[PDB]
Amino acid sequence: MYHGALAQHLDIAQLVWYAQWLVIWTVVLLYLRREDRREGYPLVEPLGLVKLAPEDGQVYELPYPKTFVLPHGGTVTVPRRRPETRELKLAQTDGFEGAPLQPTGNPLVDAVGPASYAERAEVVDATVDGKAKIVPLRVATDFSIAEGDVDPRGLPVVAADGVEAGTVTDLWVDRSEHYFRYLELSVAGSARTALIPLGFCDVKKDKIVVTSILSEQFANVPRLQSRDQITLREEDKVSAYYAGGLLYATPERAESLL
């Protein structure tokens, strides 16, 4: 006799082989792939005429809604319907649905393509204690630049075209993670300040190089509602403006690199 041998010419390991695959596919398809759909669903498509076709499939692929109880009050439920009625200054380039869209105006200002921001909440991200998380050092006086690193305060900001766009006036730090996330500068020729994510900054000892946008485009950087405070959506608007420059700073950037 043999340990593991069963009737019908089969054995225990052989059965477990099928069971393992069943467990794997069940978790992957029924659980994980549904968790993957808590954002962006149900999908959308051009109608042109009032029609109703929810489709069983749109219900089957979704998991039951979950609700997050926020640390500072309120709740968030996903998935949930989140239509984007915001007018997009984009036009079709061709007829087929797979065709890309083309901006109709200034993509950076209109916020389309890589210049798009998400409809995040217009609330100030908070520290565990309920204070504003991302703030300038003028406010977070108990914070400072580590000894050994460049203090950008006072340095000029040089855009992709080589011309000075303004002067750095402060640094916005993440009080929750002790990490700088933005630099604030005065825009030359204009009468305003503007933030820029550090990820778009090449910090040199004598200057801050920014290749994402040209000097002139600094004038239209999204503005904050408050001076020493920034909302989650504003951070998205600011970061997205510069990213948009990577593809739209000049007409050439959107065309093939090679």
């Binding site: 082989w17 921001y117 640094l171």
Partner: protein
Amino acid sequence: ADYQTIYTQIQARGPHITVSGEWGDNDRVGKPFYSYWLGKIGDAQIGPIYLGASGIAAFAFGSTAILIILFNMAAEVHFDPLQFFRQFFWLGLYPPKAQYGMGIPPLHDGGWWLMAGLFMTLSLGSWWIRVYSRARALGLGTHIAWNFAAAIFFVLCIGCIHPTLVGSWSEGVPFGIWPHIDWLTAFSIRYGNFYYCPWHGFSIGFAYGCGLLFAAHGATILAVARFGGDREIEQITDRGTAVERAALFWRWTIGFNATIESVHRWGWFFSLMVMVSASVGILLTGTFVDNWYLWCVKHGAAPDYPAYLPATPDPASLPGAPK
């Protein structure tokens, strides 16, 4: 290029943060000190550290196991300091060499090994409590502890469960650098080549998979660091452009995508399955399968090849051949 993804150009400093737990706040010891260079690629703050009964116990049980092993290793070189340093990697504490079944082997042939295993196990269990309780104390889910439990379970599988299932302590993993490595080949050989064990294959698929996923996820978050993608918690509760772009990158590349929260579930799952798959494989080995290669031949999966040099009949089966 986003230089911030390589290292932190301008580091920040501020009062250290302390999040109160339901208990144990008075068990935190030390004074946080900072490292400027570590701050280039990570948080500059080191310490303080939490003590607590679980952690202390873990070190007590662990230190004992370690001393049992080190002492037996020292005996291997007749307690000579120079040879101990030189031969370290080659030294080890072995399970019983003789077959006593499940009988407690004498100290000189498996006894000390069994003792070290017991203390290591207690050490692992104690540290698990720390991993679990710290989460609950800080009001966090226990996802990490459940993953850690699977890793611990696998160690128990190769350490004592498989041995108990076949009825022999001689099958355990010895303690030592090279010695625990040698066991791998001894075990694979004894059970007909582990490459043919499906669960060895599953475990590898998930391990390689973890490599693929962390490289992919790590790179994805760095790619959207300019949009604050690293602040995953709030990207989960309030989707930002960082994760919309991350999702679209993958959707446009492979045809489907995850969410900033679910990708962590995929990673947690893949990591978990490395240990779960390995454990199932070890539980089936010796218990219900004796030779994995032959098991695959039996089920028609094993590849076969023509001979290059002449096919060679087993000499032992030839007519008139000796024993």
